[PDB]
Amino acid sequence: SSQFIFEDFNPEVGYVAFIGKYGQQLNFGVARVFFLNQKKAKMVLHKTAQPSVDLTFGGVKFTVVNNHFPQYVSNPVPDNAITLHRMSGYLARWIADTCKASVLKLAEASAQIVMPLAEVKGCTWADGYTMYLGFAPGAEMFLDAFDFYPLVIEMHRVLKDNMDVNFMKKVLRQRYGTMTAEEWMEIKAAFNSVGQLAWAKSGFSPARTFLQQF
Amino acid sequence: SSQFIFEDVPQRNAATFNPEVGYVAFIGKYGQQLNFGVARVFFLNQKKAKMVLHKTAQPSVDLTFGGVKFTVVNNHFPQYVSNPVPDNAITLHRMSGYLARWIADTCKASVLKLAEASAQIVMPLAEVKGCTWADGYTMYLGFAPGAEMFLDAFDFYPLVIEMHRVLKDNMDVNFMKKVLRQRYGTMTAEEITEIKAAFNSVGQLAWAPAARTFLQQ
Amino acid sequence: QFIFEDVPQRNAATFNPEVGYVAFIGKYGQQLNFGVARVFFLNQKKAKMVLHKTAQPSVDLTFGGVKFTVVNNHFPQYVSNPVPDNAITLHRMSGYLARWIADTCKASVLKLAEASAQIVMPLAEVKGCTWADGYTMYLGFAPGAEMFLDAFDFYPLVIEMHRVLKDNMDVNFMKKVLRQRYGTMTAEEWMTQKITEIKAAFNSVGQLAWAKSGFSPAARTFLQQ
Amino acid sequence: IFEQRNAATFNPEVGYVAFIGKYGQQLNFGVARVFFLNQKKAKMVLHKTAQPSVDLTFGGVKFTVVNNHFPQYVSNPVPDNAITLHRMSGYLARWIADTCKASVLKLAEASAQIVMPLAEVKGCTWADGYTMYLGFAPGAEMFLDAFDFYPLVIEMHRVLKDNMDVNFMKKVLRQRYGTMTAEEWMTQKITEIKAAFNSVGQLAWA
């Protein structure tokens, strides 16, 4: 008894616009801010009333289309649009794009930024990049750029704790180079990488501690 | 079958139409402000612009692509296919040539800016035999007409990618005499570093039963 | 003597009933009658020609008194032009009028008679179709009918599933046909209820012989057909 | 009268010059007010002044005004960053609308002082929101995104309700939106007719 609502542009299309606005005027540091201020940044976005708030994350002003107002919870979100969620993944890609092969640039990003959702689950850069980034909301948008990692991470949310199908339905329509990932059945490094981060174990990061937890 | 004409052997003017003729476009004239946007429209309409000039009895015409305005020497209007073309000039083939380079070089530096090409830029003569963006910016931009004039900075992908066209699906086997003339920057060849190594690497592409069962008999 | 194209699949006009919706109750249906219909399909070919020549990307055509704003993507300069989803191409106009006829003469047999009397589809006579076969086949011949295979029970499909193996037409001119729904996810890939009545339209157009219509028992003991 | 566009975006390029750095520090409802009202006899004045580039004062501060009313100088070049009366209006509109966005107090001021004469004729007024009222401003058609597509649908009823030269419409049916592009079909439903369907709720001339 809920009851209706709802069901049925490339995720990499929206991405480009940023190279003309916010792209050229951006930095390797400001990301730390974001990933460490999004959850409270989302709280305020649900109280007020101005349909298209513009958020600041480091003197950097994003025209962030507002979503979590009960009024317009269900809207037609534009392709140019840059909602909190969408906006999060693009940072995850930008820094993913910079941390490909370039060992020089890689450590700089690893040292300065932290998406909490990764470390709380216990992963860290010490095991990859992509594995780590695939925790950021909006990472499910680029499973072709995060190898298939952010998809199965949500399994480990249904697995380790529990997550509904609704918090998985959106990720299960996403695409790796279109075609392939949205098919479900070529097991593209997915079923072998469900066993390569659950090996990192869940967030017991904070021993000789016997009381049932390991 | 539009032109730009030889004679019998090169001749010539520019022994190597490059660091002096590939900067007329590049950086220099027009090059001040051009975007992939401009590139996009040019490649998507090269066919149609090649169609129009052919009906134009004007020796040198002007073409506008997503804003920017190029003066192109019309060498496909029957009559004009012969007249001497300045190295200064920017016959459409040259333009696409220089245009292909502009993306090819500017991508080399930053990998995030090239993904914008991986979105905005489309090559029909490339993607129709199934080259796609996934298969490398060298190979995709390879089917962009004019690429021939750079086998070196482009990386030997214009000769090898055209060596299978007629060499599999016919063509007059003469067109290839245009490729057979280019260099690698004096002097790596002369016509290996790959070639055939790219053959069976570009041979992994397929021209294309999805729908139905063919002539259901 | 042409072809013309739209590209590609994920297109916004995947909703033929939408862009059909508008043609009538929307604009022109409010006025449409078998008159303007008979007058259209008759002079369809002419218009395709007139269009191919005139210097305007959109042109106002009149048929049996009706009116239309048609988008000219025939003039070879305007061929790859974008047609707005609710803009009526001469092809589309032809697909809709056919559906129109299909709809109104569906159920009302009083109407199916009158349609038969007034409406000639020159893309069917030359095959020896005629009404008695059924509107769901006879109007299925019309340009544009492939948009709505459902409406014509796959009949527009089999024309190029037959005038290739009973004459000569390109496989390039069939990705045109294939790509249109019928009832959503089910039957979008030639499937679902023994290939969704694969059969009763398959040979019907081959059983209705290609026909070489015209003169009759005109015999030539002269080596002929 | 001034005059795809032709290389000239009316936001970060010439909009940002219209505020902050040029004039954007000597500006307030004071000035804004005095301008929006008495444009008729600034249009019926530069119609005569043979000068190409006149300086007009509006509540004190002076602005380099570029004249394309007056027969002869009606189709010259108009340097880009050049700020004609019609432009000035547009940028000012965008400026006020922006000042009274979120700020509810600033909202209350602007309503008291500023009066848009084109808006009132047809029984608009602030009681119908700053995107409608200020929407009437000349040049607002440069910020369809910021004035909720009203400039568009305002100009549409003029053609419908009274019968204005339809040709005029051309300019509006150009920029469309802020980002891109001029697709009338994407976001032209609840929003578009909003001003044609939902907006005539307030009827025109009384």
CSV table of C-alpha atoms in Angstrom, one decimal, chain C:
chain,number,residue,atom,x,y,z
C,1,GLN,CA,13.1,7.8,-57.5
C,2,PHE,CA,14.5,8.5,-54.0
C,3,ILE,CA,15.0,7.0,-50.5
C,4,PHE,CA,15.4,9.5,-47.6
C,5,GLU,CA,16.4,8.5,-44.1
C,6,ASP,CA,15.9,9.1,-40.4
C,7,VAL,CA,18.6,8.1,-37.9
C,8,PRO,CA,18.9,6.4,-35.3
C,9,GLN,CA,16.7,4.1,-33.1
C,10,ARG,CA,16.7,5.7,-29.6
C,11,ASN,CA,14.8,8.6,-31.4
C,12,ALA,CA,12.2,10.7,-29.7
C,13,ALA,CA,9.4,9.6,-32.2
C,14,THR,CA,9.4,6.0,-30.9
C,15,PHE,CA,5.8,7.0,-30.2
C,16,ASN,CA,4.0,6.9,-33.5
C,17,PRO,CA,0.7,7.0,-31.7
C,18,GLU,CA,1.9,10.2,-30.2
C,19,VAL,CA,2.8,12.0,-33.4
C,20,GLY,CA,-0.5,10.4,-34.7
C,21,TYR,CA,-2.5,11.8,-31.8
C,22,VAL,CA,-1.7,15.3,-33.0
C,23,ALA,CA,-2.6,14.9,-36.6
C,24,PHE,CA,-6.3,14.5,-35.6
C,25,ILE,CA,-8.2,15.7,-32.5
C,26,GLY,CA,-5.0,17.5,-32.8
C,27,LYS,CA,-5.0,19.6,-36.0
C,28,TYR,CA,-6.4,18.1,-39.2
C,29,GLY,CA,-8.5,15.2,-38.1
C,30,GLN,CA,-11.1,17.7,-36.9
C,31,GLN,CA,-11.8,18.2,-40.6
C,32,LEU,CA,-10.7,15.0,-42.2
C,33,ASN,CA,-13.1,13.0,-44.5
C,34,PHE,CA,-12.7,10.2,-47.1
C,35,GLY,CA,-12.8,13.1,-49.7
C,36,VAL,CA,-9.5,14.7,-48.7
C,37,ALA,CA,-8.2,11.1,-48.3
C,38,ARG,CA,-9.1,10.0,-51.9
C,39,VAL,CA,-7.7,13.3,-53.1
C,40,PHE,CA,-4.5,12.8,-51.2
C,41,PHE,CA,-3.4,9.3,-52.1
C,42,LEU,CA,-4.2,10.0,-55.7
C,43,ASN,CA,-2.0,13.1,-55.9
C,44,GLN,CA,0.5,11.8,-53.4
C,45,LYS,CA,3.2,11.2,-56.0
C,46,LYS,CA,2.8,14.7,-57.5
C,47,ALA,CA,3.4,16.2,-54.1
C,48,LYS,CA,6.5,14.2,-53.6
C,49,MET,CA,7.7,15.8,-56.8
C,50,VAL,CA,6.6,19.3,-56.1
C,51,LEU,CA,8.2,19.1,-52.7
C,52,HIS,CA,11.5,17.8,-54.2
C,53,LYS,CA,11.7,21.0,-56.1
C,54,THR,CA,10.5,23.9,-54.0
C,55,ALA,CA,12.9,26.2,-52.1
C,56,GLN,CA,11.2,26.1,-48.6
C,57,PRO,CA,12.0,23.6,-45.8
C,58,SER,CA,8.3,23.5,-44.9
C,59,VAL,CA,5.5,24.0,-47.4
C,60,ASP,CA,1.7,24.4,-47.2
C,61,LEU,CA,0.0,21.6,-49.2
C,62,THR,CA,-3.8,21.4,-49.9
C,63,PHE,CA,-5.7,18.2,-50.6
C,64,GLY,CA,-9.4,17.9,-51.3
C,65,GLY,CA,-9.7,21.3,-49.6
C,66,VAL,CA,-7.4,20.4,-46.7
C,67,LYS,CA,-4.9,22.6,-45.7
C,68,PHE,CA,-1.6,20.8,-44.5
C,69,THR,CA,1.7,22.2,-43.3
C,70,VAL,CA,4.2,19.6,-44.6
C,71,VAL,CA,7.9,19.5,-43.8
C,72,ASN,CA,9.9,19.3,-47.0
C,73,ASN,CA,12.7,16.8,-46.6
C,74,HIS,CA,12.7,16.0,-50.3
C,75,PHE,CA,14.6,18.9,-51.7
C,76,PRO,CA,18.0,17.1,-51.5
C,77,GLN,CA,19.5,20.0,-49.5
C,78,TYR,CA,16.9,19.4,-46.8
C,79,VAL,CA,17.2,15.6,-46.8
C,80,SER,CA,19.1,15.1,-43.5
C,81,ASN,CA,17.1,17.9,-41.8
C,82,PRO,CA,15.5,17.3,-38.4
C,83,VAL,CA,11.8,16.8,-38.5
C,84,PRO,CA,10.1,17.9,-35.3
C,85,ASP,CA,8.2,15.0,-33.6
C,86,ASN,CA,4.8,16.7,-34.2
C,87,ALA,CA,5.7,17.9,-37.7
C,88,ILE,CA,4.1,16.0,-40.5
C,89,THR,CA,6.3,14.7,-43.3
C,90,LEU,CA,4.6,13.7,-46.6
C,91,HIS,CA,5.4,10.1,-45.6
C,92,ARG,CA,4.0,10.5,-42.1
C,93,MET,CA,0.9,12.3,-43.4
C,94,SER,CA,0.5,9.1,-45.6
C,95,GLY,CA,0.9,6.8,-42.6
C,96,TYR,CA,-1.6,8.7,-40.6
C,97,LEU,CA,-4.3,9.1,-43.2
C,98,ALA,CA,-4.1,5.3,-43.7
C,99,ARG,CA,-4.5,4.7,-39.9
C,100,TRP,CA,-7.3,7.3,-39.9
C,101,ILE,CA,-9.2,5.4,-42.6
C,102,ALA,CA,-8.3,2.2,-40.7
C,103,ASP,CA,-9.8,3.5,-37.5
C,104,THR,CA,-13.0,5.0,-38.8
C,105,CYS,CA,-14.0,2.2,-41.1
C,106,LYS,CA,-13.0,-0.3,-38.3
C,107,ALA,CA,-16.3,-1.5,-36.6
C,108,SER,CA,-18.6,0.7,-38.7
C,109,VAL,CA,-19.4,-1.4,-41.8
C,110,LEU,CA,-21.7,1.3,-43.0
C,111,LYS,CA,-18.4,3.3,-43.2
C,112,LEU,CA,-16.2,0.4,-44.5
C,113,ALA,CA,-18.4,0.3,-47.5
C,114,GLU,CA,-18.2,4.0,-48.3
C,115,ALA,CA,-14.4,4.0,-47.9
C,116,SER,CA,-14.3,1.1,-50.4
C,117,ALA,CA,-16.3,3.2,-52.9
C,118,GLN,CA,-14.2,6.4,-52.6
C,119,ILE,CA,-10.7,5.2,-51.7
C,120,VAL,CA,-8.2,3.9,-54.2
C,121,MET,CA,-4.7,3.1,-53.1
C,122,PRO,CA,-2.5,3.2,-56.2
C,123,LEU,CA,0.1,1.1,-54.3
C,124,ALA,CA,-2.3,-1.8,-54.3
C,125,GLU,CA,-4.2,-1.8,-57.6
C,126,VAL,CA,-0.8,-2.2,-59.3
C,127,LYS,CA,-0.5,-5.4,-57.2
C,128,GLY,CA,-4.2,-6.4,-57.8
C,129,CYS,CA,-5.1,-6.0,-54.2
C,130,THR,CA,-8.5,-4.3,-54.0
C,131,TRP,CA,-10.7,-3.8,-50.9
C,132,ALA,CA,-12.2,-7.2,-50.7
C,133,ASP,CA,-8.9,-8.5,-49.3
C,134,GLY,CA,-9.6,-6.3,-46.3
C,135,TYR,CA,-8.6,-2.7,-45.2
C,136,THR,CA,-6.0,-4.3,-42.8
C,137,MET,CA,-4.1,-5.4,-46.0
C,138,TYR,CA,-5.3,-2.9,-48.6
C,139,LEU,CA,-4.4,0.2,-46.6
C,140,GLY,CA,-1.4,-1.7,-45.3
C,141,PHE,CA,0.3,-0.8,-48.7
C,142,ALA,CA,0.3,3.0,-48.1
C,143,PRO,CA,3.6,4.8,-47.5
C,144,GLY,CA,4.1,5.1,-43.8
C,145,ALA,CA,2.0,2.2,-42.7
C,146,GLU,CA,5.0,0.4,-41.3
C,147,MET,CA,4.9,2.9,-38.3
C,148,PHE,CA,1.9,1.0,-37.1
C,149,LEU,CA,2.3,-2.7,-37.8
C,150,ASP,CA,-0.2,-3.4,-35.1
C,151,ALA,CA,-2.9,-1.4,-36.9
C,152,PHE,CA,-2.2,-3.3,-40.1
C,153,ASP,CA,-1.5,-6.7,-38.6
C,154,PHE,CA,2.1,-6.7,-40.0
C,155,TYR,CA,0.9,-6.2,-43.6
C,156,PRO,CA,3.2,-3.3,-44.4
C,157,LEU,CA,6.1,-5.4,-43.3
C,158,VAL,CA,5.5,-8.2,-45.8
C,159,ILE,CA,5.6,-5.9,-48.9
C,160,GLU,CA,9.4,-5.7,-48.5
C,161,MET,CA,9.3,-9.3,-47.2
C,162,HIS,CA,8.0,-10.2,-50.6
C,163,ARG,CA,8.9,-7.6,-53.3
C,164,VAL,CA,12.5,-8.7,-52.5
C,165,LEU,CA,11.8,-12.5,-53.1
C,166,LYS,CA,9.1,-11.8,-55.7
C,167,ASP,CA,10.9,-8.8,-57.3
C,168,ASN,CA,14.1,-6.8,-56.4
C,169,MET,CA,14.3,-4.5,-53.4
C,170,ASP,CA,17.2,-3.6,-51.1
C,171,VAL,CA,17.8,-4.9,-47.5
C,172,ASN,CA,18.8,-1.3,-46.8
C,173,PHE,CA,15.1,-0.5,-47.4
C,174,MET,CA,13.9,-2.7,-44.5
C,175,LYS,CA,15.7,-1.5,-41.4
C,176,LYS,CA,13.1,1.1,-42.3
C,177,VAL,CA,10.3,-1.4,-41.7
C,178,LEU,CA,11.9,-3.2,-38.7
C,179,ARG,CA,12.3,-1.0,-35.6
C,180,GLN,CA,8.6,-0.2,-34.9
C,181,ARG,CA,6.8,-1.7,-31.9
C,182,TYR,CA,3.6,-3.7,-32.0
C,183,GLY,CA,2.5,-3.9,-28.4
C,184,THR,CA,5.8,-3.0,-26.7
C,185,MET,CA,8.7,-5.3,-25.6
C,186,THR,CA,6.9,-8.4,-26.9
C,187,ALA,CA,7.3,-8.6,-30.7
C,188,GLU,CA,10.0,-5.9,-31.1
C,189,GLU,CA,12.4,-8.6,-32.3
C,190,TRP,CA,10.1,-10.7,-34.6
C,191,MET,CA,8.8,-13.0,-31.7
C,192,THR,CA,6.2,-14.0,-29.0
C,193,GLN,CA,3.1,-15.9,-30.2
C,194,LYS,CA,4.7,-18.2,-32.7
C,195,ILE,CA,6.6,-15.1,-34.0
C,196,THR,CA,3.4,-13.0,-33.5
C,197,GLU,CA,1.3,-14.3,-36.4
C,198,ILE,CA,4.4,-14.8,-38.6
C,199,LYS,CA,2.3,-16.7,-41.1
C,200,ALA,CA,-1.1,-15.2,-42.3
C,201,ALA,CA,0.5,-12.1,-43.8
C,202,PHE,CA,3.6,-14.0,-45.1
C,203,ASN,CA,2.3,-15.6,-48.4
C,204,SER,CA,-1.0,-13.7,-48.5
C,205,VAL,CA,0.8,-11.1,-50.7
C,206,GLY,CA,2.5,-13.9,-52.7
C,207,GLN,CA,-0.8,-15.8,-53.0
C,208,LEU,CA,-2.3,-12.5,-54.1
C,209,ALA,CA,0.0,-12.9,-57.1
C,210,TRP,CA,2.2,-9.9,-58.0
C,211,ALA,CA,-0.6,-9.7,-60.6
C,212,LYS,CA,0.8,-7.6,-63.6
C,213,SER,CA,-2.6,-5.9,-63.8
C,214,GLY,CA,-3.9,-4.0,-66.8
C,215,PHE,CA,-5.5,-5.5,-69.8
C,216,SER,CA,-7.2,-8.8,-69.5
C,217,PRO,CA,-7.8,-11.9,-71.7
C,218,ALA,CA,-5.7,-10.1,-74.3
C,219,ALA,CA,-3.9,-13.1,-75.7
C,220,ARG,CA,-0.7,-12.9,-77.7
C,221,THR,CA,0.4,-16.1,-79.3
C,222,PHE,CA,3.6,-14.1,-79.6
C,223,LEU,CA,5.7,-15.3,-76.7
C,224,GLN,CA,4.5,-13.0,-73.9
C,225,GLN,CA,3.2,-13.1,-70.2
